[PDB]
Amino acid sequence: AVKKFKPYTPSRRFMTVADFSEITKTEPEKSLVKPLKKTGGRNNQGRITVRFRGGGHKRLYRIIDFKRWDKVGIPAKVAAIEYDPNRSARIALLHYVDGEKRYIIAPDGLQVGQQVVAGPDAPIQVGNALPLRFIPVGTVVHAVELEPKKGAKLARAAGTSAQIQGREGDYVILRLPSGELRKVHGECYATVGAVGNADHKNIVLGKAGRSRWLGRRPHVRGAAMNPVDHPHGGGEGRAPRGRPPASPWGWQTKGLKTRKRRKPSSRFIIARRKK
Amino acid sequence: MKRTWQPNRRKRAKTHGFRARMRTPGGRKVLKRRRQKGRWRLTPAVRK
RNA sequence: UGGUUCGUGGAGCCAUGGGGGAAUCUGGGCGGACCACCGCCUAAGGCUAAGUACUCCGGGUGACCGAUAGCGCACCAGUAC
RNA sequence: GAGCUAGCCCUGGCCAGGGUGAAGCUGGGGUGAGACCCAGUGGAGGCCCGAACCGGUGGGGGAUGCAAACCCCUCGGAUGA
RNA sequence: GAAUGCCGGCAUGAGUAACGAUAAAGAGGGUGAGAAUCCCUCUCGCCGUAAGCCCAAGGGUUCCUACGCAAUGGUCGUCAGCGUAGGGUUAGGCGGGACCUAAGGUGAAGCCGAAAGGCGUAGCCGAAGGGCAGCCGGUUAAUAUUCCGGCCCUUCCCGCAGGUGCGAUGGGGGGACGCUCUAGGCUAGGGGGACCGGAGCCAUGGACGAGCCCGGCCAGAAGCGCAGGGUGGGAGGUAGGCAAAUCCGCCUCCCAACAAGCUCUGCGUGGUGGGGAAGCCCGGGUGACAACCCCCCGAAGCCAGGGAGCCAAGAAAAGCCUCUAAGCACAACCUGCGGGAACCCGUACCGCAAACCGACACAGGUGGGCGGGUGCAAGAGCACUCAGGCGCGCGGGAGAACCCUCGCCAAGGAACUCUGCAAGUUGGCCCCGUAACUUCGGGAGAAGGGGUGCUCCCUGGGGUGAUGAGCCCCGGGGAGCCGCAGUGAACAGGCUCUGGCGACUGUUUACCAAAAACACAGCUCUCUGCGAACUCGUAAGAGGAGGUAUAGGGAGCGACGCUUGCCCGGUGCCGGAAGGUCAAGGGGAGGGGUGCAAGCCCCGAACCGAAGCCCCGGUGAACGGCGGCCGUAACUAUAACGGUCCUAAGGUAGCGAAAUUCCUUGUCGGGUAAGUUCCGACCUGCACGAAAAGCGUAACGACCGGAGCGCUGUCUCGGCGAGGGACCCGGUGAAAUUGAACUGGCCGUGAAGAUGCGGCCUACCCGUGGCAGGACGAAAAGACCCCGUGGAGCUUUACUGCAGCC
RNA sequence: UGGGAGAGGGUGGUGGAAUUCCCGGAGUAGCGGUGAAAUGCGCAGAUACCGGGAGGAACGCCGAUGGCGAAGGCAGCCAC
RNA sequence: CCGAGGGUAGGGCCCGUGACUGGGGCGAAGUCGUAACAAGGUAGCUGUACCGGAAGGUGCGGCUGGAU
RNA sequence: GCGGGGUGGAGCAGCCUGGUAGCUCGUCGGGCUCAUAACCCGAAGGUCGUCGGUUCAAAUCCGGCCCCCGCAACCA
């Protein structure tokens, strides 16, 4: 439930912040955090390989459990729900009856003080994790492994979810957050429910300063540069593109498909994404 | 105004120093050249 | 594809990155596509002085210089700066 | 060669004083319950005025300079990209 | 003899400019061969959030003392950061190392690359971060938390005593963290005292006073006191913390809880050790048995890992504590006490500058700490001033033009000019009051106005203390006094109306552009299913991201409001298992060379044969494009209407002589005495138009227009005055330039603009202050133009390759 | 106090019919549409037929000249 | 002291006028088409939305003041 | 300066490739209609801007001249 401000500055006009309602605990679990190594968009050569990155707030990484089949049968309680600066979704702290503590990403509606569990026999209930084959067709689901035991890769962002459309041999059919229809192996785990913090996309940054806080440095247009820099560089006064719109490196950027043609997973993608 | 030489003993020793030269193929030829020419000092003076 | 005088040329020979893939003398390579005949040679292991090149070094000698010349330096110079 | 300069990374430091008075909270009023209104509290902000600090708007001077970019007056930012 | 030749030497400009901040000097006395310049004294001025003091970096003897003055010092020099010599830097506790980790670097394992080399886990290195035990005074010509004195503390070794399951590079706890705001109590620091100590002073009209002037503390172990921080206790179960575990985590039970206890830190006290002014007398002696007390103000510092709120969600590792494992429990560890042991490097001096970076003793640049007092609303602002430090390493005169910086000016008041450029004006605080418009915040310090000193009397509330006195903090009312003037000096907005552009705060061409340019939140298209797309790399490997479509890349547009029309024929991209074309390869009709022959050898048609291209579609917030001629209404004029040609389709809404309009100062209206600009309209828009967005928009702007009020030396139109120069004298003494020069005017001539040729005219020889018309004056082998089968950046449906991709 | 009828309203759930699209099968020269046609779709295999899947919207028969609500209006079925 | 009024500054209401612009009423015999009255040749009317020289057209929902 | 145009009354074919003037509208006569238009049936009208040349022959090919739109006019 996004929060607004009164127009007492030019930027507070439109700025919106998250309500942080679900958050019940405001400093992380010391045994589950390690330093995030900020890159600036630079690789081991020292070179910028992703432009316009750097200078954001300092962060601690929170170790998330993306393989809940680690602890089949052992139930856990939802101890708290916390802010996580490294993802859009919120996270939940779990106190296993084992004594072990872990983070998962928090699904929508998950309430503190409830039990969650993982395994083939687990109840179809928000926060539980099962191999896809044991989840009923029609169930909305998140944090989905793409291959068995390799880790949750799909539907992790705030508010996202995938839905089960049917089964076919060792595989189930998923509708991904993007709209694509894909076969995913039945032994892949998935947590039932959708990811929470769905109001996330309604946040209005409001000023250039907030982009900077997030580590996003200013993005300069191709049209604003010179020919040595970019296909759209140069021109006396303003210029339209004067060629098919390109990236800094020369390839076309309105419509050119870039998925590799002979990729083996093509055999598992039924229908390309919607919209 | 602020000029370009801003001395720094750590900076000098780590950049032009003896051990910096020996670590690199091009650094070694510098020493080899400066010896062949008979330079009284192969490497910049810095008090460390 | 490289080497050769050979820049695709009638293009052999020597070498070899890729594919196919033998034989032991009645075996195999060469003589400028290729074939016959007539000859030369014995691949896919390796070593080998001398005659040849150079001059940091030492000596000998100049129709070589003689301090703006001769080495950048005749002198505390690869120095001062 | 990044001891100048541009960006990023790690780790420290700095920003006199004054002004404006958001949300929230409290009390009062209001209503079926509300919205909401008033007062007090509160102390938000690429908010306001202005030093340090960072700048370099206009003019004057300087022009074999004090200076291979400086000096004087004036002016911009000053809790933030 | 010439090459703007090379190297060196010496001229000219010239006794010329200059002598490096306009904070400022004068005299007396010394020294010496020599004194504006060295030393001393008195007077004067300058800094005082420094121009004073303490660190760090960098510098590297420049520090102290003696003896010197050739050169260095912009003059001088007896002086010096200069020459010569001798001396000088003292640590278990300060800083760094024998401790830890950050980025990063390196790198047993491992991976990759023609060679060289590139990666890379652990580990190791790496600091201004973590951790860790010394405070006060004295002493030297020069070092001092280092030497000395006093009082304290740490680690290592060995020993004794008491205690304990001891033991780790392994497990766990802790270390351990942001921004803004902020409580209580303290300390640093400061103000005052009619109290305490002090050499003295009484002037020039008055004062022997409850007078003046000076000072009135610093450190400290245990204990104690005040203020804080940190922390629940016991028990049963236990499958997790990669072995074990009595620890930690999880569940249950009892008790505790805004406490208390235990523990830790700050502050106060504290045995003890220190310090101690003015003034006088010669750094010292006295003062002095110095006194060392009370009240107030009071931190941004301390208690601290305190409290609250917020979102952008805020290092690691060691020391330390706990758990145990091998092992060992004659051990070993913990605690107390004792003796012993305790290494290496730095330490001088400069340090906003004459010792660092700028070729210079250069008006520039250089990070951290302390930075006193009074008054002005506050303050690190401003004026003066303490401690302390300076007068800036040429001076002395003169009193011209002209230049710079500064002050004033009759009447007028923008008439100046491209432009009010510049300079006036306004100016702080308190109160009154405040418009269009608006996104309801604002616009707003709108505008405009009143007040402001001093004296006496009355009174209201707060802090400390005690509730009172005292001190300090906010005030309220009444009556008076003086001046031209009361923020009496210094610091401190001119305002209003109306357009264009850009929403806004920001950003930029270091050193001629700060803007309307870039960025920006926001909108749209498009790519990407994760070993993602994309980017860097030959690769390995990285980034993307320890992210996962509410995400990540690319592109355009640029808050917000209302909107964004028509064309898919060409180019692009997307879809299309057909068809056409199509390389290597497959296939081998049919030939060919050679041989006696088996054979060996070469060419080779039909036919099968990818991507690409062709072909069929789609697609505009993809590249892009959005007509011509003729006629027509009952005054005229103009055409709602019609005809026909062409196109893929013929520009919609909105706007329009515009940052776009050529003709153009279009035409009309407004403003003005007068308006090529401005504003409002009209529409034949040379040549607006809808995300290279269209039309608007409150607020914002050192942006660019136009107008008005205020006020002025901008101007009519100039005058006077000040200081620094210019001028004169003493000292030191450049520069570009320069074929040589004995270097005049006119009218002609001349390669067409003559001091130099002709004719005439004029003119004794040589300087100094000035002015710039000429010497086609100086500077820079024109940066425009052309030429060179000269070069370089950039573009593309120029050519030809290559990466990459298929 | 005891009873009744009802598409009165709000929430969560859920059922079948049909249209469209996608995959498989089978199959050939047209389908569609109109007053008649043309555009359009179809040998790149359409229409018509069968099996499978996805998705949205509206609830046939009951149904009435019916019922409920203050009006606007309210119709598959179930529970609250 | 108050005080007619004068002056400086800023507001509010009314009237008059203004390049140009918007639609409106009216005017014997203009141009364009034919929306409505008959099922007016697409039943009409309607609130709203979008489009078009013009009357109007179309969408969504509503009314009968609808013919048969 | 370079480019393309001028043909029945209107707007366009024919020009390149010499002999053949064509399309829609309009106009004139008739028809339907009470009447007009729409609609149906017939018909007329151009010697191709002009002058000159090549040719057996010129709208056509080549030269002037008259005219009409269009593009250009840059470096200082």
Ligand SMILES: [K+]
């Ligand atoms: K030019």
Ligand SMILES: [Mg+2]
């Ligand atoms: Mg808001």
Ligand SMILES: [Mg+2]
């Ligand atoms: Mg509001």
Ligand SMILES: [Mg+2]
């Ligand atoms: Mg939340």
Ligand SMILES: [Mg+2]
């Ligand atoms: Mg940790």
Ligand SMILES: [Mg+2]
């Ligand atoms: Mg990371």
Ligand SMILES: [Mg+2]
């Ligand atoms: Mg990373």
Ligand SMILES: [Mg+2]
């Ligand atoms: Mg690396």
Ligand SMILES: [Mg+2]
């Ligand atoms: Mg490197």
Ligand SMILES: [Mg+2]
């Ligand atoms: Mg990139």
Ligand SMILES: [Mg+2]
């Ligand atoms: Mg980057």
Ligand SMILES: [Mg+2]
């Ligand atoms: Mg994320």
Ligand SMILES: [Mg+2]
């Ligand atoms: Mg989160």
Ligand SMILES: [Mg+2]
């Ligand atoms: Mg799978």
Ligand SMILES: [Mg+2]
């Ligand atoms: Mg969003």
Ligand SMILES: [Mg+2]
């Ligand atoms: Mg961030």
